[PDB]
Design a protein around this ligand. Sequence first.
Ligand SMILES: [Mg+2]
Ligand SMILES: [Mg+2]
Ligand SMILES: [Mg+2]
Ligand SMILES: [Mg+2]
Ligand SMILES: [Mg+2]
Ligand SMILES: [Mg+2]
Ligand SMILES: [Mg+2]
Ligand SMILES: [Mg+2]
Ligand SMILES: [Mg+2]
Ligand SMILES: [Zn+2]
Lengths: 129, 199, 81, 209, 96
Amino acid sequence: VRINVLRDALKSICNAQRIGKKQVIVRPSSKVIIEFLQLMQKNGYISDFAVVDNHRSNRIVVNLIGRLNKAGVISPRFDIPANDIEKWVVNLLPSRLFGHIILTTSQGIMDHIEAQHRQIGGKVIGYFY
Amino acid sequence: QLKEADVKKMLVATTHLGVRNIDRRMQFYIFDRQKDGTFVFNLQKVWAKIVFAARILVTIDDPAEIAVVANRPDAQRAILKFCKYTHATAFPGRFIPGNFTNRMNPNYCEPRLLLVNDPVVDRQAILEASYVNIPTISLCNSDANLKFIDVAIPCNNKTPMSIGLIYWLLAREVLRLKGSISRTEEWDVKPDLFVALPE
Amino acid sequence: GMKNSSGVVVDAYIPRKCSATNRLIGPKDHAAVQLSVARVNDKGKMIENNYVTFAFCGAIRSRGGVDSAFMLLAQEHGLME
Amino acid sequence: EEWHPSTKLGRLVKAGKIESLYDIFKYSLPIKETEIIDYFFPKSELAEEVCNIMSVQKQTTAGQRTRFRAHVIVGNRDGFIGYGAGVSKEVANAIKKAAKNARLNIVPVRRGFWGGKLGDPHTVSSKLSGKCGSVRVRLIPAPRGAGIVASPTVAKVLEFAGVSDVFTRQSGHSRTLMNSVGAVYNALKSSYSILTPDLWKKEQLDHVQ
Amino acid sequence: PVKRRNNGRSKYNCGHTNIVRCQNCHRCVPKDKVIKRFTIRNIVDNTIADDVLNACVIQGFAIPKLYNKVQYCVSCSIHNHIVRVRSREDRKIRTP
RNA sequence: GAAGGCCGGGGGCUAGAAGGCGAUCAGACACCACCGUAUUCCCGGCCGUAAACGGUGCCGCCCCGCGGCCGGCGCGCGCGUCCCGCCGGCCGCCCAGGGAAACCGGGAGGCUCCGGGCUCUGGGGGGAGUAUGGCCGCAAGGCUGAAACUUGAAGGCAUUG
RNA sequence: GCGCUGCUGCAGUUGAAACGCCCGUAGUUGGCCCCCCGCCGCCACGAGGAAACGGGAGCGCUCCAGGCAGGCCCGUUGGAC
Ligand SMILES: [Mg+2]
Ligand SMILES: [Mg+2]
Ligand SMILES: [Mg+2]
Ligand SMILES: [Mg+2]
Ligand SMILES: [Mg+2]
Ligand SMILES: [Mg+2]
Ligand SMILES: [Mg+2]
Ligand SMILES: [Mg+2]
Ligand SMILES: [Mg+2]
Ligand SMILES: [Zn+2]
């Protein structure tokens, strides 16, 4: 059965971007998907998107610009102590200069840079570069 | 802009008639299907494509760097006249593999643009061009595979008249764009030269 | 455009980007081509020697569809639209 | 006697029209003459090295026919590396063919910083992975002064390419030398083909060349 | 390794098929794996068909035919040249 | 839960383990020919194994192109069991991609750029699916399942002879 | 060393290895939706609680392994954390 909607959405996004398309459709929308896409947009990776209301698990349409290189999720959301982020950065990201790691905290969904700025920790959701 | 004379010439030339098969990458050029099943092209689309190809051709300053390849017996005459009037280079007959990668081949050249009449019959040269960063423009029928085909001209390419007519129109357009001739006066050359003659 | 600590670019060279897929073209991509299209005066029949340039990577060419991309790009850059 | 260009690019290089190798690489123009580089590399800035020499046999009606396969790498220690192989009935002729092939194929190497930026680049731009046969390689940027943590064979390639800090991991049958060298060569080759946020700048194309 | 994609038989959407007996050796073979040919022949060889027609008293008579379906096993077909061992590329050909 | 096998009753034509006999052979108690018991068939009940194979666990998402067949439904007209589609199923070829390769591409893809969920199995070759225990079964046997000792290779795909 | 015990991080068409198939309890995993209330997990901080070892501030046992010292006009000299 369907479990992780975000994983399906990200896989579809990468599949479409691989063959140089311009628009993708994701079926089951959700708040977490919307925040993930908002962060991606803010960092300049996927331009804009729209949500279509059908009264049943709204759909969503996104527009690409051939900048995204890889996106993914960590299924069992482990807890990241505020001082245990550099290990994950080294393990997951190509470099310490570019790339982002998404965490959910009591203060909301934020990039790992922001969490390092505020010296707090939380749970890991995904990553992209 | 398409004129009545041009459309009537194309219709008498049976240029808009294709084949029973269809490809998903050409459905945009298809306008209708006949009762038997033959597909019907769109004259405005092919005209716009011819104009675009003529522009691309005139972008090259030296006509000697353009290669015209055709293994079809019917095309030979049309390509020969096209190159003679445009002062380009022709590769009639069989295409020797290694003509573009083997520098020791007696007939070896470095073209900048390549022109083909049928990918199926001339696929050997298309790959060779793909090895050396050479764009290609080809004449594609209803069922064509556009692997490494930059520009596709939607036209018939089996009837002897259609082959000669398209080349004649292309030569006319390129010469006009070059400024040698004007649009209003009909070209002195008649299309019958490009069509192959029996016996 | 990898800047130094002083803002001085230290990249050897900036490679080209496909005009459709926005993808870097590698030094060894031998199926990568670049074309030009000529501009036409008001009277027609004449080129003004102003050309617009495009570049395409090998992957899109192999997969096809470069024709549709070229059509849309020309329409966006010209009156064909 | 004198070198007679057999190609348009060769003739242009004979003239002073082209002034640098990056002007060739940026258009993905193939190189077919060994002179196209030595004219750009006259001084002994580059260096050649023989990696491995293996003998291969072909059974026949009466005994075996033996031959030698050779592998050679070349680089200037400044963002340039090449790798080639050659086979011939004589060891020296195989070495010459391998050296010519290594010279023929060459790629630039992108170099970057680990964390802090200061001075010239010293390590690979990011993580680079390569594949050949069963062998996979990983190159992770390292801090300044960390040296090259790699096997003797791969370390020679890294030194020739001009990299002073890097962490390496090898997987698969690494005792097959040619496949490991090919994997590292491909990983290095991929460097100038990965898009980064610094390269997002949109530049208009130039009609000239 | 695997030599054929069909595994040497035409078996789709099923688990078992009825068996048949080879007409030369009487081996038991699956129906989908046996080599089958249909033949139509005159009861009388064409050499003496004219002679028989000359001798026949009936007017408007027609020579009757024989309709038989021959089934052979893999070993016997090769031995009797009903099928041949082909090259790797020719194995994909399905036309007579 | 194939076939064979067992228990208790029916039935008895073909074929045919065992057995007999004629040939072949140096030998032939085997291959070939002939006769022929159990069995092959039905009823009730045990056994619970097969190359029980697509040698590919189940649920779910995305995904090049061309084509054939089966079932159902809708559209169009010049009304043909025509052609344009949708869902489900069975197949063929195949660009990318993947792989040690053969090859797969309705995945064996989206994976060292290596995290969707659940269950089972494996850790060099023999000794050995053996010994000893336990459960099951009328039995034949099935499930579970070592150690000492020994050994430097055993295997897969492909190339030339 | 060994990503040959694999959470990070193995393999299961052909090399060793997907139960013959179905139902099914324990177990594990479970679409989307309400801005502010309660509880559980989670993150941060804090209190409380032996040192030695380990890290670490300062000091020229001639250096070092070490130790907690020394000169003078000493943070109340110091042995902080
Ligand atoms: Mg075999
Ligand atoms: Mg079966
Ligand atoms: Mg039975
Ligand atoms: Mg099995
Ligand atoms: Mg994995
Ligand atoms: Mg193992
Ligand atoms: Mg073992
Ligand atoms: Mg086996
Ligand atoms: Mg096995
Ligand atoms: Zn037979």
